[PDB]
Amino acid sequence: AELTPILPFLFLGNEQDAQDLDTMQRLNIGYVINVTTHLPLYHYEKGLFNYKRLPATDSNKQNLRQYFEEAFEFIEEAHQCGKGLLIHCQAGVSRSATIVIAYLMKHTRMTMTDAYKFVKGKRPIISPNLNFMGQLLEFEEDLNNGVT
Numbered sequence: 654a655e656l657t658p659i660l661p662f663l664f665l666g667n668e669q670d671a672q673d674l675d676t677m678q679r680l681n682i683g684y685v686i687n688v689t690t691h692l693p694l695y696h697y698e699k700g701l702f703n704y705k706r707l708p709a710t711d712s713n714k715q716n717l718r719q720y721f722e723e724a725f726e727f728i729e730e731a732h733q734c735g736k737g738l739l740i741h742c743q744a745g746v747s748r749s750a751t752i753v754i755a756y757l758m759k760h761t762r763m764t765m766t767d768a769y770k771f772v773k774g775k776r777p778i779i780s781p782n783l784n785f786m787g788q789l790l791e792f793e794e795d796l797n798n799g800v801t
């Protein structure tokens with residue numbers, strides 16, 4: 654069990670981390686983003702959290718940019734009402750860390766490199782995915798040019 658707090662309201666974890674019900678309620682988490690196609694929404698039937706599923710796979714062809722804006726608003730929703738958000742996928746946190754890094758670029762105004770350094774400092778194990786890196790690099794281009 655290990656929920657990594659990126660921001661006071663934004664938490665990063667894997668499949669096993671999302672199953673620790675006691676820790677999630679201790680940290681005042683009320684929102685969960687599940688970035689998998691096959692994993693269940695843990696503790697859904699208990700009616701404690703608001704869920705959002707980004708149906709993605711951990712492949713070199715998966716497009717995560719399409720899920721960026723939807724995830725940012727769910728995070729803002731958790732932020733604007735004083736609750737924490739947990740975003741998770743599987744062991745390598747490749748998918749979920751990509752979304753978190755994207756959020757830090759758009760809203761916290763950090764650069765792509767600095768955002769990775771920020772998350773990597775708090776979450777030491779992140780599996781590599783050149784496809785997601787390319788999408789984050791292309792995403793930084795659009796932010797600097799005023800396209801998104």
Ligand SMILES: CC(C)(C)C(=O)CSc1ncc2ccc3ccc(Cl)cc3c2n1
Pocket residue numbers: 746747748750751754765766769779780781782783785786789
């Ligand atoms: C995208 C994701 C977080 C899923 C990932 O690929 C983690 S693995 C890794 N390993 C070595 C690196 C060396 C420089 C670097 C500069 C920028 C960015 Cl975003 C990543 C790296 C980098 N990332």
